[PDB]
Amino acid sequence: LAHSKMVPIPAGVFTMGTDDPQIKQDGEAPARRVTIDAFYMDAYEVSNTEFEKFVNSTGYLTEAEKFGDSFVFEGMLAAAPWWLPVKGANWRHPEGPDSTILHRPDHPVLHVSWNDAVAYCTWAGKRLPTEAEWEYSCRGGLHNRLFPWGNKLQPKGQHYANIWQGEFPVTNTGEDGFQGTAPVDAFPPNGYGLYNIVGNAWEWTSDWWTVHHSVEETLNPKGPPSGKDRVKKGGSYMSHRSYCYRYRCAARSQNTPDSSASNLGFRCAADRLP
Amino acid sequence: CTPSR
Ligand SMILES: *[C@@H]1O[C@H](CO)[C@@H](O[C@@H]2O[C@H](CO)[C@@H](O)[C@H](O)[C@H]2NC(C)=O)[C@H](O)[C@H]1NC(C)=O
Ligand SMILES: [Br-]
Ligand SMILES: [Br-]
Ligand SMILES: [Br-]
Ligand SMILES: [Br-]
Ligand SMILES: [Br-]
Ligand SMILES: [Br-]
Ligand SMILES: [Br-]
Ligand SMILES: [Br-]
Ligand SMILES: [Br-]
Ligand SMILES: [Br-]
Ligand SMILES: [Br-]
Ligand SMILES: [Br-]
Ligand SMILES: [Br-]
Ligand SMILES: [Br-]
Ligand SMILES: [Ca+2]
Ligand SMILES: [Ca+2]
């Protein structure tokens, strides 16, 4: 296991966003050409084991632990009736106090806030990716495709990401092999060597959230200088076409930086190898 | 898709 390995994301220009937005309120549009300098991206979401190394090293208490609760999806026992603030739910106890991570060390760490993620990545000699870096990486060298691998959800009849199958939120069939999270090295890599960049856990990025984007060409954009929510990308194991169609690289959502949930994790990036 | 705290 090398679940902290990074891959070189090549220098390039890509179309960020889309002129065919699927969720218009999220500012998926307009499409804009963005230039990204070569950098490194974690091949995997940060796993429980990797996060545990950080916590072992630093003694870090995550915000969910300090707050004493975090959001858990009702189906595994608010923004929606299916989100419950559960006392004692945190990265070590992802569905509450009588859940454990002992059997899922290689699954993505959850209930980590933006601050928690920044703490981890910086500890690791890394940083959060910007939204543009994240999306560029997600797209895996393809232009204007829905998903890291293309435009078909199940290419060649194969599941390519851990999302929801069935009727959300009542029934997750686990057709793709995972009802909750999957190991961080599950599913095929995209063209750049990234695993679970869409689906599995949502992923924090460094950007403040805005829905107002210029069509101006940009270089290594960092997002707006101010905001109240940070950008998260990629969807999760709860995502479905019918209500949270955000397992697309262009998709985007947000949360306040102190937010945590049972479907939200992260991966790091770095300008050079740490 | 995720509630804010
Ligand atoms: C985080 O630290 C804990 C506590 O030290 C580690 O678990 C112990 O590791 C020692 C040394 O190998 C073992 O002999 C013990 O059996 C473990 N004790 C407990 C309480 O589990 C744990 O391995 C560390 N985790 C990571 C990911 O590095
Ligand atoms: Br629009
Ligand atoms: Br459990
Ligand atoms: Br074990
Ligand atoms: Br595992
Ligand atoms: Br930090
Ligand atoms: Br950072
Ligand atoms: Br697109
Ligand atoms: Br395809
Ligand atoms: Br798999
Ligand atoms: Br321009
Ligand atoms: Br979701
Ligand atoms: Br904060
Ligand atoms: Br860096
Ligand atoms: Br939701
Ligand atoms: Ca699934
Ligand atoms: Ca993910």
Torsions phi, psi for A166 (to 5 deg): 115, -155
Alpha carbons A227 and A241: distance in angstroms, whole number: 28
Helix, strand, or coil (residue A36): strand
Do the beta carbons of residue A176 and residue A163 sit within 8 Å? yes
Residues of A with CB under 8 A from a CB of B: 63, 67, 71, 78-80, 83, 85, 113, 202, 229, 232, 235-236, 238-239, 244, 246, 253, 255-256, 258-261, 263-264
Residue where the block lists tokens 């899922």: A104
Domain hosting residue A191, numbered range: 1-274
Q: Which of B1, B4, B5 sits opposite A244 (nearest CB)?
A: B1
Look at A260 and B4 and tell me if their CB atoms are within 8 Å: no
- How would you class A268 by CB atoms within 10 Å of its CB: exposed for 0-12, middle for 13-18, buried for 19 or more? buried
Q: Catalogue the E-assigned strands of A28-121.
A: 32-36, 39-42, 69-73, 83-87
Classify residue A146 by burial, with Cβ atoms within 10 Å: 0-12, 13-18, 19+.
buried
Determined by X-ray
CA A55 to chain centre: 20
Q: Rounded to an integer, what distance in angstroms lies between the CA atom of residue A210 and that of residue A226?
A: 9
Ligand having the closest approach to the CA of A188: 10
For residue B1, what are its two tokens?
């898709």
The CATH number assigned to the domain holding A43 equals 3.90.1580.10
Burial of B1-5, coded b for 16+ CB within 10 Å and e otherwise, reads bbbbb
Q: At what angle do helices A48-58 and A114-123 cross, to 10 degrees?
A: 80
Residue for token pair 């179309």: A15
Instruction: Give the nearest ligand 1 atom to A50 CA.
Output: 27
Provide the number of structural domains found in chain A: 1
